[PDB]
Design a protein around this ligand. Sequence first.
Ligand SMILES: Nc1ncnc2c1ncn2[C@@H]1O[C@H](COP(=O)(O)OP(N)(=O)O)[C@@H](O)[C@H]1O
Ligand SMILES: Nc1cc(Br)ccn1
Ligand SMILES: [Cl-]
Ligand SMILES: [Cl-]
Ligand SMILES: [Mg+2]
Length: 386
Amino acid sequence: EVAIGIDLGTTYSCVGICRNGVVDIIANDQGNRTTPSYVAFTDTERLIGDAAKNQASRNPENTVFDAKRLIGRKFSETTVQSDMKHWPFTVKGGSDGKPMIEVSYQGEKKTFHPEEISSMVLKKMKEVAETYLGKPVKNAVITVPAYFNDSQRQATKDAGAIAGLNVLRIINEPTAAAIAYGLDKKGKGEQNILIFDLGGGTFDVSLLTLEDGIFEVKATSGDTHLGGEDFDNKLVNFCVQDFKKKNGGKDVSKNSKSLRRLRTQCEKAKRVLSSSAQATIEVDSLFDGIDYNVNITRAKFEELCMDQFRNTLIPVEKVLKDAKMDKSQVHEIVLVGGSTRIPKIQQLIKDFFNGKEPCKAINPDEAVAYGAAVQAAILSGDQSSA
Ligand SMILES: Nc1ncnc2c1ncn2[C@@H]1O[C@H](COP(=O)(O)OP(N)(=O)O)[C@@H](O)[C@H]1O
Ligand SMILES: Nc1cc(Br)ccn1
Ligand SMILES: [Cl-]
Ligand SMILES: [Cl-]
Ligand SMILES: [Mg+2]
C-alpha cells in the first residue's frame, strides 16, 4: 500500500513520500536529503551512498558511480567509449554486449551489470524510506531522463525489481519536476514549461506543454557532460596552477590522489560560494607534504566558469527553436539540479527570460523525487495532492 518516489540520479538520488497530500523528502542516516549514487566494495564490506563516496579517493578502483551512463547501453556504444576515460573502475563488454563493471570485493574479482549497481542505490533509497516510515515499502515510481530510450527505461525498471520494488511507473524527470510544482493543476489552459536541470554531471533542458492535466515533452536538449563536477574541475585546474606558482613549479596533477583530495575541497568551496562572497580551499599535505591554502572570491569562481555558465543558454535557445516558439511564450521556468543554486546561473536564466523569476521554491536537487512521490501517491489511489 505504501508507494515512494525515487529520483535515481547520475551523481545523487533522492526519495520522497506523498502522504495526506503533502510530500516529505526523506533524510538518510547522515541527515542528508540526497544520497550519492555510489557503490563501493572493500576487503570487508559493500558501502552505498555517503559511505561509498567518502572513501572514493582511498579506493578508486572499487568505487562505482555513473552507472546511469551505462544502464541499458551496449558496451560498444560511442558514448561508453568516450565516458569510460572518466572512470577509475574497470568496465568491459560481456558476450551479450552488455557492460560488466569489475571490482575486487573481499579479495575476489566480482562483475556487475549497470542495473545491478543501480539496484543497490535503489535498495538504499528504499531502506531510507523504510527507516523513516517504520514499515516495509514495496511500490515506487522511478524517474529517468526524457531522452532515455526503451532499453535504458527497461533496465532502470529491472534495477527496481532487483531492489525489491514493484515499479508502478517510470516517468520523465522534467515531467516529475513540473508535477512537483502543481503546474498540471492550474486553470490557465495551455502552459509552456521550461525545465532547466543542471545536476552533478549532466545538463538537461526540456520544453513541456501542458494542456488538460497532460504533460507532453515538445523538445529536449542539453549537454550530457556539463554539470557541477565541471565547475569543481575549473577550481582544481586553478589550484594546480596556483600551487605551481607557490612551490617552484611542482605539479599536483602528476598524483591522482592529490587531485582527488583537491577536487573534494573545491566542490565544498563551490557550495559555500552559492551563499557567501568568499570561500577557502585548504588541503593539508596535498603533494610532497606541502600544505595548500587559497581564498576564492565568488567573482573569481564566476570568471573561471564564465563560458560554461553562459553556454547553458545555448540548449535553451535550441529547445525553443525545435519547438518553434519564442522565449516570451514560456509560462514557467523550473530550476532543477543542485547546480541551479549557483547565483550566476540563476541570474543568467532570469536575464535570458527578460526578468521572469524562475520557479525554485522546492530544493532543486529534491524537485524530481518530490514529483515522483506525488505521482506514486496518485497511482496508489490517493487523490489528496490535488
Ligand atoms: N549549494 C550548492 N551550490 C552549488 N552547487 C551545488 C550546491 N549544492 C549541490 N550542488 C551541486 O549539485 C550537484 C549534484 O546535484 P543533484 O541535482 O543532486 O545531482 P544529480 N545526480 O540529480 O544530477 C553536485 O555537483 C553538487 O556540487
Ligand atoms: N560532466 C561530466 C561527465 C563526464 Br562522463 C566527465 C566529466 N564531466
Ligand atoms: Cl503512498
Ligand atoms: Cl513519519
Ligand atoms: Mg535532480
